[PDB]
Amino acid sequence: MARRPARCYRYQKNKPYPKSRYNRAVPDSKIRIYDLGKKKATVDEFPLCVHLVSNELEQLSSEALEAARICANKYITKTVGRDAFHLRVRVHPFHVLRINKMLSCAGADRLQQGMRGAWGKPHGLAARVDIGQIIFSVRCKDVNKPVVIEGLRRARYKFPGQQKIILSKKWGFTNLDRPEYIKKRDAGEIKDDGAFVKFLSKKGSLEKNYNEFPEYFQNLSA
Amino acid sequence: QNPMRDLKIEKLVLNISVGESGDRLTRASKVLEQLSGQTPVQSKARYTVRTFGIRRNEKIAVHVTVRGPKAEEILERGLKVKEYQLRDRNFSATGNFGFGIDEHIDLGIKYDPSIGIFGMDFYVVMNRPGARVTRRKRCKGTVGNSHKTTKEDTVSWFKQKYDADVLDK
């Protein structure tokens, strides 16, 4: 059957209704990939982080997430290549939408009881977002800033509501600011872990910290 | 080093696992009481598998446990058929070790008719004097990490006794 418009499920009017042991007959999400580009790149390779942030409390459907994922990826791949960016789709469509399917043929009043038994069968998935919640996070080098800006601006047209694009003072996807990340990287407290980094804590076993971060103790002795 | 830290035979358990019950099990029970000098118990089957011919609580197995000098003399004659030599395998990570043979009626006892031929699984439990602290009722403590049994100290115990060899593969 044909899908309803997104104005039917735009606002967070219901409680979050995930796929569980009670809600079993849920169709799969139309979005399946959430890390794109050079996702295997080191954190030092991509210092700039650009966030697409929702400004409204609404629901983004999984189809809108997939269409915005395709549209943003297609522009950045065509402009600055594939390995110049890492696109991360932060939000995930866990909220299951319900549809009460009404018959549109003549004589439908006999075969349909109206609002009796009106509990909706599962229709699709949607990502419930809040105000200030990050939708897309694209990290890249400092050179490719307006390409990612235009890529995230072209991703807004597939999204309901109002979204804003902000550049992040965080070094990539980390929770640390750019000067604080530079101090820990220069002091050797940062170890690469493929897609993210592990930070040296001042708590824990010193033998395990010596095995994991040998550069910090060598530089402390220096 | 310490006389309270040397190994000893805690217990030595003989278990056999017959495919069914009945006459074969009763012959299996009497060969073990002739083996050990004490009656064995008949282990009941836990479930039904569809492949082994066993149903639940059918008494498909027989096991008995000997301790002390009886366990020592049966381990001497248990390695006489195993030629006082063994592998780096068959030793558990907790220091215990076991081995299986295919015959006992014509091993070191006289053969008698209407008893069958039965193999068996020896299993030996090794610990130190001081294993009561994890088995007593009041103040059931643990064992110290320098007092546990490993593979290395038990193969070394298996060297200092029997003049044995290891890794026959």
Partner: protein, 292 residues
């Protein structure tokens, strides 16, 4: 091994004496509780515990902040009364059960009445309440984690306390000589256990057998030159001395508590504070990294 952090975070520890293993708290709940319409009357527990070379009997009552002790009787006070060897046997358990019963009866002032049995014959006899007088002191046997076995020493102390005038409710199923085929006790076997016939008949059989185990065991018997027929004599003498003087003469306590605290503190390990801990990890962060 290698327990996860989530396991340690959710781990609800038991009660400390359950962790030690000395207390059955499900058992403790139905001993130490009281009928709530017996409002502030404490329920008194006869607790008999078996460490090695000791019988520990104490009449104790559970309160809010802990258990207070009325009368505590130990094994090592019986060498004063005469029992020099075998301070953890069945007969010594009877003697310290007899001792603690006479001790708490004289503590509460009921020593003149409630004599129990002056001569022991080995029959199950609850101490009856006297006609127009005070009731006998009602304690209950709290055996703890020991197993309930017919002919065990905790029932020896139970028999000894019941023979001392202490009212402790029990049955004769756990006394030695209990027939499993009829409900009749063996009073001759119980009396022999009371006076040590289960050790004296072992002694005469071992003396008739050999000398090697009769000198490895029972070497204190050969040291004090006491024989198999003298076991009943010294236990009757111990029983008479217990009835005569249950007044709990305490020991000397030489080299007193200030010196006890001083000598224990010199051979004890002190805790490094924040400054010493920070200094020693500063030493080891330089030593393990010192061009390593």
């Amino acid at each position: 091994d290698a327990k996860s952090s989530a396991y340690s975070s959710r781990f609800q520890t038991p009660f400390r004496r359950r962790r030690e293993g000395k207390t059955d708290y499900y058992q403790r709940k139905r001993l130490v509780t009281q009928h709530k319409a017996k409002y502030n009357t404490p329920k008194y527990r006869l607790v008999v515990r078996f460490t090695n070379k000791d019988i520990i009997c104490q009449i104790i009552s559970s309160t809010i902040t802990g258990d207070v002790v009325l009368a505590a009787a130990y094994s090592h006070e019986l060498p004063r009364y005469g029992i020099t060897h075998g301070l953890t046997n069945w007969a010594a358990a009877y003697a310290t059960g007899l001792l603690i019963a006479r001790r708490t009866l004289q503590k509460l002032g009921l020593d003149e009445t409630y004599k129990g049995v002056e001569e022991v014959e080995g029959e199950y006899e609850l101490t009856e309440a006297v006609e127009d007088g005070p009731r006998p002191f009602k304690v209950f046997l709290d055996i703890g984690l020991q197993r309930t076995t017919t002919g065990a020493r905790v029932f020896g102390a139970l028999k000894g306390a019941s023979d001392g005038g202490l009212y402790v409710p029990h049955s004769e199923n756990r006394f030695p000589g209990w027939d499993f085929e009829t409900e009749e006790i063996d009073p001759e076997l119980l009396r022999s256990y009371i006076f040590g016939g289960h050790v004296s008949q072992y002694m005469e059989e071992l003396a008739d057998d050999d000398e090697e185990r009769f000198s490895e065991l029972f070497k204190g018997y050969l040291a004090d030159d006491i024989d198999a027929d003298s076991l009943e004599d010294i236990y009757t003498s111990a029983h008479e001395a217990i009835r005569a003087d249950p007044a709990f003469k305490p020991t000397e306590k030489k080299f007193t508590k200030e010196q006890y605290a001083a000598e224990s503190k010199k051979y004890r390990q002190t805790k490094l504070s924040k400054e010493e801990r920070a200094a020693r990890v500063a030493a080891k962060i330089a030593a393990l990294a010192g061009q390593q």
